């Protein structure tokens, strides 16, 4: 009898999900943020964001193919967070930290927000 | 910077499992002899050579129901489906052969190799 945990399995799943996203395979929503559109998998968005979890749990919104976010959100900040969702890697820089932080607050992504606070503390 | 979040992928996978448990955004039913299992095509493709082949095939990719070989043990399938969504594999002497054969059919090499390791440790 053995109960085995595969330590790299989740990362490899995420990599494959990102591969699918990159190829537009099984993507089921376009997120619109002012001057940019972004394609994604609803399930991944739900998995990574309190806002998207709330949006797509709502049966009136669950099957929408387009979601318009607040047009005051910085699209670059959104793009950085979308990339993070699919890779575990966060491209934080002095030139984007404030935008990433505010976007992560809006998306309800607490660990990123806290990481931004740590970046600010060390700056 | 590029900050790496070591627990992110695991947390995504567990949230996907929660969505599967609640039947949220599942898009396929897998039939194994008398038994049915709902899942997300994206996760199946991410975890299985067989499902990746099926859902990249022009003729099968838009199917909402996939019938597996009825010779597959549904318990074996359930164990592998749970593994896909959790990274945890329930292996014991009374299920090893069924799990291994199922993993071969599903084209899940790491699980097959782990089964061979279990045989080395126990035969
Ligand atoms: C991996 C990761 C996730 C989040 C992150 C994801 N969600 C949404 C979420 O939990 N969704 C689901 C929850 C559940 N359940 C079932 C019942 O039991 C508990 C909840 N089931 C399915 C789904 Cl899809 C968040 N909601 C709020 N806040 C503050 C967050 O931070 C996150 C943030 C970051 C960051 N940074 C991150 O890396
Ligand atoms: C995490 C995990 C995965 C597998 C596992 C998954 N796939 C399917 C697969 O590769 N899918 C994708 C591949 C690609 N790319 C694009 C760029 O070029 C390279 C291929 N893009 C998107 C997807 Cl979805 C497998 N196919 C064959 N064989 C033998 C396997 O073992 C697996 C098995 C196990 C186990 N056990 C496991 O834990
Ligand atoms: Cl909308
Ligand atoms: Cl971490
Ligand atoms: Cl046993």
Curated annotation (Swiss-Prot), chain B:
Q: How is it modified after translation?
A: Phosphorylated by ATM in response to genotoxic stress. Phosphorylation induces its degradation by ubiquitin/proteasome pathway.
The induction annotation reads:
Down-regulated during maturation of dendritic cells by selective stimuli such as bacterial lipopolysaccharides (LPS), CD40LG and zymosan. Protein levels decreases upon genotoxic stress in a dose- and time-dependent way.
Which residue range or ranges hold the BTB domain?
Answer: 26-93
Where in the cell is the protein located? Answer: Nucleus
Tissue expression, per UniProt?
Answer: Expressed in germinal center T- and B-cells and in primary immature dendritic cells.
What happens after mutating residue 110 to A?
Abolishes interaction with NCOR2 and HDAC2, no effect on interaction with CTBP1 and transcriptional autoinhibition
Q: How does it assemble?
A: Homodimer. Interacts (via BTB domain) with the corepressors BCOR, NCOR1 and SMRT/NCOR2; the interactions are direct. Forms preferably ternary complexes with BCOR and SMRT/NCOR2 on target gene promoters but, on enhancer elements, interacts with SMRT/NCOR2 and HDAC3 to repress proximal gene expression. Interacts with histone deacetylases HDAC2, HDAC5 and HDAC9 (via the catalytic domain). Interacts with ZBTB7 and BCL6B. Interacts with SCF(FBXO11) complex; the interaction is independent of phosphorylation and promotes ubiquitination.
Disease with which this protein is associated in UniProt: Chromosomal aberrations involving BCL6 are a cause of B-cell non-Hodgkin lymphomas (B-cell NHL), including diffuse large B-cell lymphoma and follicular lymphoma. Approximately 40% of diffuse large B-cell lymphomas and 5 to 10% of follicular lymphomas are associated with chromosomal translocations that deregulate expression of BCL6 by juxtaposing heterologous promoters to the BCL6 coding domain. Translocation t(3;14)(q27;q32). Translocation t(3;22)(q27;q11) with immunoglobulin gene regions. Translocation t(3;7)(q27;p12) with IKZF1 gene 5'non-coding region. A chromosomal aberration involving BCL6 may be a cause of a form of B-cell leukemia. Translocation t(3;11)(q27;q23) with POU2AF1/OBF1.
**UniProt remark on domains:** The BTB domain mediates homodimerization. Its dimer interface mediates peptide binding such as to corepressors BCOR and NCOR2. Interaction with corepressors through the BTB domain is needed to facilitate the rapid proliferation and survival of GC B-cells but is not involved in the T(FH) formation and BCL6-mediated suppression of T(H)2 and T(H)17 differentiationrequired for GC formation.
Q: What does this protein do?
A: Transcriptional repressor mainly required for germinal center (GC) formation and antibody affinity maturation which has different mechanisms of action specific to the lineage and biological functions. Forms complexes with different corepressors and histone deacetylases to repress the transcriptional expression of different subsets of target genes. Represses its target genes by binding directly to the DNA sequence 5'-TTCCTAGAA-3' (BCL6-binding site) or indirectly by repressing the transcriptional activity of transcription factors.
Q: What is this protein called?
A: B-cell lymphoma 6 protein
Query: What organism is listed for this UniProt entry?
Result: Homo sapiens (Human)
């Amino acid at each position: 009898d053995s109960q085995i945990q595969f330590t790299r399995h989740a990362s490899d799943v995420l990599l494959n999900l990102n591969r699918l996203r990159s190829r537009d395979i099984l993507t089921d929503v376009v997120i619109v943020v002012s001057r940019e559109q972004f394609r994604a998998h609803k399930t991944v968005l739900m998995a990574c964001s309190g806002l998207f979890y709330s949006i797509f749990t709502d049966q009136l919104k669950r099957n929408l193919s387009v979601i318009n976010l607040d047009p005051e959100i910085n699209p670059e900040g959104f793009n950085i967070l979308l990339d993070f969702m699919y890779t575990s890697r966060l491209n934080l820089r002095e030139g984007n930290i404030m935008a990433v932080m505010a976007t992560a607050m809006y998306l309800q992504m607490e660990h990123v927000v806290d990481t931004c606070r740590k970046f600010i503390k060390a700056s």
